[PDB]
Amino acid sequence: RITTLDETVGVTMSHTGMSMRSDNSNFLKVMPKKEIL
């Protein structure tokens, strides 16, 4: 069955939106004229 996360919610909800934590995973990161003559 589906497992229910029992934590204090605020941790998971902090990991949802902006959490001041970016990156941490690499994915889709992607003259003389005479001589010249």
**Cβ 25 to another protein shortest distance, Å:** 8
Helix count (H) and strand count (E) of the chain? 2, 0
SS3 of the chain: helix, strand, coil, percent, to 5: 30, 0, 70
Using CA atoms, how far apart are residues 11 and 21, in angstroms rounded to an integer? 13
Q: Does 24 bind another protein (CB under 8 A)?
A: no
Among 1, 8, 30, 32, binds another protein (CB under 8 A): 8
4 near another protein (CB under 8 A): yes
Q: Which tokens sit at 25?
A: 């995973």
Among 1, 16, 32, 34, binds another protein (CB under 8 A): 16
**Per rule CB under 8 A, is residue 36 in the interface with another protein?**
no
